């Protein structure tokens with residue numbers, strides 16, 4: 001360089017052949033530029049990069065190779081990992097299954113903690129060879145727990161998603177004067193129906209028979225917002241959290257315990273403030289326009305338990321209602337459930353029973369068992385009432401406000417409707433490209449797709465399915481087969497439901513109301529996504545623990561094929577819900593006679609279909625790698 005010579009070398013440097021792509025590693029790696037273009041990265045060039053870094057590289061020939069030059073976006077930022085080789089030099093291996101190398105690190109200042117071998121930390125990347133640094137380097141920013149802590153699962157997972165490990169701090173109660181007029185519901189025979197363990201009754205039922213074969217339902221929901229003022233510390237604390245995070249064996253509540261457990265909870269034979277909704281149902285099950293929201297106080301008559309209620313109703317088991325009054329409430333409520341089920345059957349969509357697996361844990365967080373808790377009438381009684389109540393709120397907020405915290409499902413996006421109909425044709429199912437975009441046509445497709453003898457064709461259109469949203473705008477819910485949809489029935493566990501509670505309270509008083517900001521539903525969606533990941537990561541750890549001792553044994557498990565790709569089949573164990581992977585080479589000896597097609601949902605050997613997505617097969621457990629929590633399964637025989 002030399003101003004002339006420098007300008008020249010610059011212009012030369014600038015026209016050097018280049019490519020942008022994502023780094024893929026293993027033994028050297030590749031710069032994956034697109035679907036059918038990749039460049040070999042030699043292992044010396046490897047050193048500059050991490051798996052998954054988005055980079056620009058010099059392309060070299062003379063055999064072509066990519067020589068990394070510039071970082072576009074690093075794979076790794078904030079992460080978790082296990083520390084090594086102590087303070088005389090710390091390094092950290094990311095928990096990332098594809099990131100195998102130790103990264104030199106040190107503790108952030110103020111981090112009191114003396115790190116040892118095995119310790120779990122949260123860390124931040126600070127240096128990268130492509131940013132000119134000699135080495136990769138990270139700062140440790142948080143001490144997690146020690147390497148052989150039994151409670152690893154929980155603490156590492158909460159930390160990795162940066163989620164809170166604690167309930168919020170309780171604040172001196174005193175009930176707020178919102179100038180509500182509370183109807184005295186106290187004489188009435190309200191009952192709660194929850195599982196056994198529950199001490200935090202959110203909700204509350206009362207039924208009454210009417211002339212013309214009608215039924216009256218009142219849903220009474222607990223009253224947190226009668227204590228928590230909009231703008232208070234608990235407020236802003238609850239809003240950040242969005243939802244109680246339910247993890248195997250462990251929840252982190254949105255609200256303080258005293259409030260949840262005690263003051264708000266609809267405990268039997270105690271007087272409680274409530275937000276109530278009285279609805280009138282046709283013989284049809286139809287929710288009539290008769291909808292009345294109002295503040296009230298009730299006194300639960302009977303703290304009921306699901307199984308017991310399900311038993312009494314099927315004339316099985318030992319348990320009877322404490323009185324005729326309660327019996328009649330249960331009977332009326334079962335009648336309501338029946339009409340609503342029918343209604344949703346006929347006019348909406350009823351979701352197909354998905355086993356809900358519960359981990360049964362011991363004191364050191366061991367897995368005793370994982371059981372699919374099946375659903376019985378008492379469960380459906382509650383669900384049908386909660387759904388009708390939430391429909392009620394959606395209508396009234398839409399009507400009286402024009403806004404609320406709504407749950408939103410747009411159906412198939414218009415730009416994918418043609419591809420949709422074409423794929424169904426190839427499988428022999430007629431549907432229309434523009435009818436399926438109407439609520440009615442979406443429901444008709446769903447219905448006949450669930451009359452399918454198997455889930456195959458179903459599976460074929462997962463790729464077209466939209467997901468459930470959060471909106472302040474009233475809107476249809478195609479998944480539920482409903483014009484509208486907003487929840488207010490569990491405000492102690494959901495910030496959105498508290499917001500709707502305050503909105504409904506404005507409507508009741510004839511007050512004006514402010515529309516929630518859209519950043520509202522954005523943060524809510526982010527925490528939901530977080531909580532779901534947190535629960536599956538827990539579960540994953542747990543499943544590995546549970547299945548470790550089955551490794552290499554001939555224990556069989558029936559398993560549903562959930563996904564098929566290039567490298568093999570993902571599989572869900574029917575009896576416990578664990579995820580396992582079956583590598584392609586396990587399915588057939590001769591690589592070139594085997595085709596696992598992601599796009600078809602099939603595995604073929606010598607041109608003949610042997611496996612399909614939704615098939616159930618029997619597998620054994622080949623491997624449980626505790627490092628990565630991965631379960632490897634092999635088909636039987």
Ligand SMILES: Nc1ccn([C@@H]2O[C@H](COP(=O)(O)O)[C@@H](O)[C@H]2O)c(=O)n1
Pocket residue numbers: 052075076077078079080081094095096097099160
């Ligand atoms: N596109 C991607 C791919 C991975 N990464 C991160 O790499 C992280 C590495 O996980 P660990 O925290 O276990 O090392 C992932 O959990 C993910 O947050 C990312 O931030 N963006």
Ligand SMILES: [Ca+2]
Pocket residue numbers: 093094095096097098099100101
């Ligand atoms: Ca790793």
Ligand SMILES: [Mg+2]
Pocket residue numbers: 192193194201202203204
């Ligand atoms: Mg309840």
